[model samples]
Target chain A: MASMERFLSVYDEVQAFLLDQLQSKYEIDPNRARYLRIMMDTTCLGGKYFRGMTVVNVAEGFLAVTQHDEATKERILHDACVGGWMIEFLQAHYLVEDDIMDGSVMRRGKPCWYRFPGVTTQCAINDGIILKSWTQIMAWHYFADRPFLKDLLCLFQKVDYATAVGQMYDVTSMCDSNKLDPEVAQPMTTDFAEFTPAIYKRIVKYKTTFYTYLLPLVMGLFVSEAAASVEMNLVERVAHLIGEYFQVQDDVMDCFTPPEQLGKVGTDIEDAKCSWLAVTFLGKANAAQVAEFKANYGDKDPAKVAVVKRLYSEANLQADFAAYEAEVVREVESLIEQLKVKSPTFAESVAVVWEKTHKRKK
Target chain B: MASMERFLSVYDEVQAFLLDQLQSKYEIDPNRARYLRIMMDTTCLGGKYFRGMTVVNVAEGFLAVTQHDEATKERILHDACVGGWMIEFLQAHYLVEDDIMDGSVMRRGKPCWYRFPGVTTQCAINDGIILKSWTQIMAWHYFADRPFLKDLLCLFQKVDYATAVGQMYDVTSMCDSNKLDPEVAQPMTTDFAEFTPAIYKRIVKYKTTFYTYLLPLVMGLFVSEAAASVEMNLVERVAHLIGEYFQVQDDVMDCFTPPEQLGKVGTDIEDAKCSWLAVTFLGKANAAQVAEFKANYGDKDPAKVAVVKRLYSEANLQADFAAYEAEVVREVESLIEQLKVKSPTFAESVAVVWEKTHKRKK
Candidate 1:
């Protein structure tokens, strides 16, 4: 309860700040005024604040620790929350269309805007853009005069560009039918061998790592005014490793996690997703098992899904996942050990995030 | 051939500026690089370059008039052409979704990008954003340090926001089916009196006038270093008059013109558009005519469409169109007379655009 209270307070403050922003910045027509409420209330709500929490943590833990002062740390912590709010806003904006592309009927127990009655595809497409631009305006409104403003803009642009490009890959990688051979480079086609671990790492790095891991730490550091002193190359490198590991766990959990905790029906396989077990299971499968997988992998029918599960069971995928889980933990430990020479607190910060990612219901 | 040569050169120069912007700014994956080509070549091309040519004209005409120096004019001319190209890029980006929302299959003798095989709705939505952003980056790259930079940014942002909001209306004014009454705000419904001439004028102000007339003129003047001296409020006011006039002509021509030059099949009726004739027709119609008009307004069936055309004949829409056309020309000239205190060339610019709107085959 001690730390949980603080965590909840941070979220509450960030939410308050953004709600004010949503209200203040809306100086348009009545129709748009109505949508502002809908976008803020519906679009911006409902996410586990993994990135948001990291911003507060990195600011308080990493940034405050460096300064050894109350007033400066107090100020820096607030800015970090603002940065955290930005991360959430960015996610909200991304999900607007990400839901459509992923063909998600629901998000967090509600229909995606495009799936909802009275909200047209035209509205969703045009409306998604305003939030993103609004975020930029929000950033500039608060910190446009700061020394780090240019750097912040540059970072935001880089992150957006990287995510969009990665999204291009993410969208294009969707394979509806399973493949016999994985080597062919067909558009929207993914097969066993072709989707290597290395390929998975790159997507995670571009799509997930920067936004999820590095971005939070960097935003924290930037807001606290420690980014110039700290080496972000090292920060990014460390974040990249754990981001891949986190995504691996997420993908694995999406497939194998228990129904009650999972909360939503998983569609990764249906969307031709690259799971943690996907590459490994494909590689380890025998010709007969692989042939069965080719038929059932992307097929959403439970009977068809049962065939893919059976193949994974036959190939000892659970055992391999346990081994993978161990490897990534050790890999993170090795990086932390190496990074201790730079600063123990930084490693501790990463470990803090790394430890938070400990729950593996899969 | 004399003015044609100048016009051709204006286009060539503007095209070159955009091609350079397209070629130089692209530093992404090969897959995106191919899309960049598709976006630049297929998505951006095919417009008549009305706004673009005006950007060049205002630049060469107004800019060159004040600063009568060869080297200065040469440099300012290039900047104006860049402005011209920006206008064009904005239009191209605007059209990509405009067509999709309007359910248009063809644009300028070719298929809409979304209708093309393999080019998804997702691509159009995401890709259109980049050109506008790229235009800013190009602007900042060339002119960020200039006195006019902030003004340029301010103007561009206003244009984008105004256009997008108007586009919201543009998409929402979408009409289908015969309404028993022309007053209720049903979802995806447009009616007679609700979408009045006043409502039509505002949409044109946001959706057309600013971007097409005032934006190019202001962009041209701003870059040429004259806007600071000139009262742009008067410029915009004058431009607004012509903009409405221009839109009125466009909508009227869309309803009643030669089939050969209609370009695409005019769907002003089918889309429940607010044409110059629509409001007047609604106002003048007897109870029977109103009933018949309401029944046949947005009905897509040719037999139903025939009823609407005959209703138009009964209402004397073509006669009203001529009267509306005269009103617009006079409205613009009246504004020009009022605005001549600012500068003759400024009023002259509005008159030039006013003249250009005269030719209406459809």
Candidate 2:
């Protein structure tokens, strides 16, 4: 608990340190540094810090089991924070580019970076790259003394590649009917094609699970040098389920929750996103329902969006999600119980996260 | 010499090997694999392989100096090729994203990847990220055994950040006339206000030099473990001068050379790029000529482009460039002489490059 508090408290300091070090090292122009600073604040500061905190908390669990002087523990905690913040940086990069690609207008109660006056799509693209680049620099700066620096750097790279691959699928899966040029135009989809549960799992695992669940835990494991003692394959399996559950919960909430409650408007229906609800509803829909769903899905009209939402309600898709959630929770708990016998420290660390996320509302 | 031949001969094999390894390792979907394959061919295959070859050839130089078994020499060369191809991969990533940012239609005599049938802005953005991600994965796969793997990965990250910074400057420097919204509007530039010689050098060094010259050579030094034996600061300085000279020549040839001879039409004027020629011509122009230059600089009209070209000729920019090029050659040769005393192996490696690029036209 004290470790979590310490990690949360240093968030602002770490952000400042990153900027100060980069500007001095790169010899960045004053004007460019100002812009970079603003971009960093806009992108990196608003997160709930859940992903980052995961690294620190997990590392703490491992560190508690091993004996060390206060000085050594403090040093290790600082190093773990570097890993955590770099993951935060990595998330910012993805979100900035994701907003541009999705043409989303807002992020974290502010205009999307691309929508900002000085930060158009061009600037935003480069800014995303710059943010991602900083993660590596931050890793090298802090972990340069660590022997596992290569493993940490490679872990980041692996997650980055996975997330990008997930994004590729998500982007191409959408049915773009706006393309007019015959040469560049793709075939329009009238059905919920490729929005199957299997594909949804793949997308969520690569796009969300690896970065959100796997990366932070692994960073903690690497930093604490606990990887050799724990079953890494089992950790990965547990992470996949946890991440998939989190994303599915997000999808269910998008349809069922209000903006006042969720803090953001749901555009999944209008965006024709291959969401879990879309896949589930399509699976249960009758012939007439399928036709209505196809016609109303991906339209911007309020009435059309309502029709899609009404179909989800009629199909009682929330019950389906509840069942899925329960199943995943049970399966994960079983996995965590297995870890308890083999590695109680890791099991306890994972259980804390499960307790925090299980059956959450927002 | 045998090393150079051996390196060049394995070019196609390396490309194939990369794809083969990635597909099997990542377990990428067949549909996605097909798309990735096409994207790779479209973006990576057309380059002159100059940057990649620099790594292999330079490493070969270092290797020849150190005694090794034939099998060890072969293994070192193979490892060097991994570094080379990863540089190639990095270049492909930059070019793909560059074409999108610049709104360019052609690159290396083919339609840019972003302009391809299935590839729109959305797909292109992720593809660029994916290609960049591969460089890291490739490093991990081959250099997992190497002690300096962390150094190599960090080197790539550092260059990546540097280039993105350069791109940010280049993008923001252009005066966009299309932004009509008062809230998002920026001041329109009728003159080349920020396009100074100093800025041009900064852009060229960050955007072009580090990745093209410094990265390959350093990767060579790193791979061959010759970094400690050489003057790295001097190597960096030489790379800076050589890259600046190369970019300036490109700017000069854009106006003077015909498309038939140059293999591509130059759009530096139409794009309102911050080029060496633009900075030099602006400094030399009379008041009336300045007005003419401003009016014609960023327009796509044939007459406007022609006027900008005619002004460069009238200013006798060719003679200025010839003088600049000669000066760089002398400066770099002097640096090479210093290397010859401290590091004959590296000096000989660099000298081979100087000979190849000294007076290259197309």
Candidate 3:
């Protein structure tokens, strides 16, 4: 409990440190500083802290297998949280940029940072870079003396590249359908031709899996200096399986659940997202069904959306997805079993995160 | 000259290395790879290699003050060039993002990457990120084993943050005039209220000076382990002075020179840029002239633009600016003279770059 408290406490410290640095070190004007404070509070704070928590949790778990003094463990815990928040900063960075790119109205049930007063598209775009800059700044500041610092920084850099590439793939997959809703203003593009299963998997693997799954675990191992002790290949496999399944589940829920029930309005269909459900249905559908889908898939009309939903239902996609989810967990379990022999604590750490997402609803 | 040849050679090597890494290491698909190839070729390759060359030239000069074998000097030259190209990569990163933010049509005589066929806002945004990622990746790859690797990486990180903030300052200073042109589609925003010399200096200091002057010089110093040997405060002072003057010169050229003579159309008046000329004029103008300036500035129409230019002429901004330019060179010479006592090689290096821009018309 004390360790967890210590881990959680680093968030505010980091926030204060960054805000102070902005004023003192960077000499940013107070007005810009205040605006950035709002940006930090809004974007970095409210998330589940899933990525950050994963870093601390996995680092703790990995370190536990070896003997260490309480002081050392405490330092490890603190630094791990710093690293964890670095990931959070990276997430906020991406979210800010993604909001602009996606033209999203809201994130975390509030107006996107770009949509905030005084933040035009240009300011928001630069804000994205600031968010990313904080991650690197934090890494350089806090971990400068550590042996693992370079590796940790490299991990962040590598995942950043992968995530951007993944985003490119995801964006490229959606073609403009030119059927925008005036009131909603959602993207009306999704190229069915580009929405193959291969591309869908590629997107998830790069965009979602690398940052969400592989990065945190690898970060933990790097921090603990246990990277050489475990089978990285197995860790990556488990991460991809868990990440792939998690996204698959998200796609299914976005299609199946209502806004009130699901916590936010799902826009996969309206935005012409290359969701797993749409990709699967397209693979399974007849030519006539494909023609119907081409008409109804990206339209914002409720009737058209309903038709697409009906087609998803007709394909028994819900049942198949449920089965696939179960299968992925099984494969993950098998990998975890293999990983457990080499590093039980690390394996359990992975299991803890996977279990949190398993059969989850909003 | 042979050293210059070696520096320029790094450009193609880096391009090939990154393209190869995309295919071999990242496994980016051929189609996307082709798109990125076009992007890199268009954006990163052609900018006269100014920043990269500055890094190489400065490093070589600084290192010559110390004794080393041929092999050592050769290694230093190669590594310095690599660092130089990393700056080039960072430049491309900013240019791509800036193009999207500014909504300009052309870059280095071609359509902006976002305007390229099959490229959309989303891909371009991600491409901006990819360009930044390459800088970090290259730093980690080439400088991994070096003693000053962390310092070098940190410089890149710091300057990126500075440049982004500078850009934010620049963008926020411009207010939308709501008088855009259909034919040109130039930004029609230029807030006279925001057009202060303090803000203009802030914009240039963060945006232009840090990356354009301070970064390349500091990068050279880090690469040569000459950072400790030189007076950094003086180096930065000289850098900002030189960089501020360069931008001031650029603004003047944009307003005074023709596209054929300057190789690009001047858009400071049309875009409402926080140019030194505008800031200076704003400071000097009477209420009626301020009103006239506001009405004419940032309008895409050539007639409105002409009105702004005529006001500049009426204010004798050109003659005053020329005087300021000469005055800046005098100040820069004073700093360089002080800098020469500690490190003649580095001082001359700064002088060389400064002379490139001194009293230049285009």
Candidate 4:
């Protein structure tokens, strides 16, 4: 079965476990539980099941090789969904609070959780922490007796923490506090090259690559009760490279497509995002185009968006993106080449995922 | 041997770990780290060392019997302080955020973290989450290999989660949202005979009794590597009894004393808190008095305090409190008597702690 089909089969069970934790085990306050139901419904939907599917996929792969008995596959799938839900839980917390911090009005095509009546930034704070608490408590419930418990704990800790720090870099870079850092003193008219590249790589390094690309992949391996199947450092290195490219795909879409085309308004430039396009635009554009880019880069005038549009229009962004995709495919393919000698199936799985993800469009 | 002295000796090493975590291992944002330094400087002081000391003393007591050779005691002491510092870390997060939620201006004689320059409510939000992340990551680092690792994770989970929900009850009760609750309608300012007892009990049940009172004490036991030397349920029971009394003592002190005596202004009545005195008074007072009590209880007028002051004086609060004290003393003593049957030493320790905490005065 495909990843989504398998994930759909197990979604209810994982959610039941989460609900049981909030409703039955710790039933102290009913109102918060009610709101948490709202929280669960709101943020937990619209996921592509990427991280979750990876977990189920990889776990099933490992368990299939070891467990010839189909009965044992039931428990393997059960544990796989547990890992899947954890990834979803992490994303829910991040998205919920991230929307708030970013002052976003809409998320996944609906108003954000903090935008709901009776949920202030205060309860949003509570709700975000609640997500994390659920992940930890649920992990203990599921993985505590397993030998891989320590590994599981470490994975979540590092991944969750790295994501938060990645958030910090994103926020802090745009922060008014960064104004005092002997940087951005030039009337915000400078090249995005220095700040833009470093920031994107930093974000990809912490947020998407480790937590997204690699965490589920490794967690499945760890839970398989396997000992040292592959070098983690190499896996991390490969994941980061592919992750950065996928991120550039996001940047390309933001610059090239309007929200009418993509189901939402692009807020990247307006939000002062350290995006891939900003760095690429700064890198490849002529001085005249660069001047146009600067004039409209973080331009506060929403009406002035077309001016920045003109900057991208003048630059050969099509060629830039083609070059970008080439580099990513080259690196990803090369890494898979190395990975196949040790574990061709896992390498084949990564390639399958990359093939599925090749489309940059929404 | 003194708690303060021992804490001081190992302070640098713990500080190093925290600083290294902030600066090096997973460095991302500095503003938060910078703000957390303020968090450190503020909460890392003014602790009475009760929890920290108990951890060390109990761990030392247990470690003495286990390690026949004297040489490994150094590392044990090191780990003991690590646990102690973890306790302090828990309080720092709790106190910082609790004060914010409660609109408390002062904590341990200093202005609350939210009151600091460059600290907005957003920053307070960051501070709160940062504390938890630190606690979790720090735990993963230190206790990942310990036999009691699952125990530590569950301990933090239950305690932290219970406290948040306890806070939920507190906040939701005071919530303007409560206006929507069908029960908020007044019935001649109804008999608090049921609500009074339960609210205090519930608050103490989550806040003082389990979260604060038993948590620290039990942690010391868990770390001591002992099993079933004492019944935790019984200890939890005794703790609730003692903690309720201790909490009521606080309520008594607030209602019946002045800042000249208690070192801070009593805001329970003005703050409209569900204090022991408020419930007790509401339960016992006449309608005329309850009418006067309701008007003046949550008053905005500074001088209207005198009217509520008279409400406390005219009621039989003095006799009521005397009865409360007698019941608490009887229950606590009875608990001690039972405890003495199974754990003479632990019971003795309880008696010692109770003896030390018998008075509730500055």
Judged by lDDT, which candidate is best? 2
Full-model lDDT, candidate 3: 0.79
lDDT of 1 by residue, A277-310 (tens): 6778876777877777777787668888777666
Cα lDDT of model 2 by residue, A62-157, tens digit: 888899899988987888888888898899999999888777766766778888886678678888998898887787777878987867877787
After superposing candidate 1, which stretches have Cα over 4 Å from the reference? A1-32, A61-79, A174-194, A258-260, A274-277, A297-302, A319-349, A358-362, B1-32, B62-78, B140-147, B174-193, B253-263, B273-277, B334-347, B358-362
Clashing pairs in 3: A175-A191, B175-B189, B175-B191
True contacts kept of 2: 0.47
TM-scores for every predicted model? 0.82, 0.93, 0.91, 0.85
TM-score, structure 1 vs. true: 0.82
For candidate 1, write residues B17-86 as lDDT tens digits: 5445434642334444555565666765565667866776777667545746788777776677667777
Scanning candidate 4 chain B in windows of ten residues, the lowest lDDT window is B180-189
lDDT of 3 at A170: 73
Q: Compared with the true structure, what per-residue lDDT tens digits does model 4 show for residues A1-362?
A: 47676676666666677667656655445555555666776777765777787777677666755754776677667777888878888888887767766666666666677776656555566677667677776788887777777778777877777777676556545444343222112134254534566656876677567677777788777766643767677678777787777667766776676664454456677766777766667777777877776667675587667777666667766788788788888988999888877676677667766775686365
Candidate 1: residue pairs that collide: none
- Model 2 residue A135 distance off true place after TM-score fit, in angstroms: 0.6
Better of 2 and 3 by lDDT: 2
Interface RMSD of each: 7.6, 5.3, 10.1, 6.1
DockQ, each predicted model: 0.19, 0.41, 0.33, 0.23
DockQ versus reference, model 2: 0.41
Candidate 4, lDDT over the whole model? 0.67
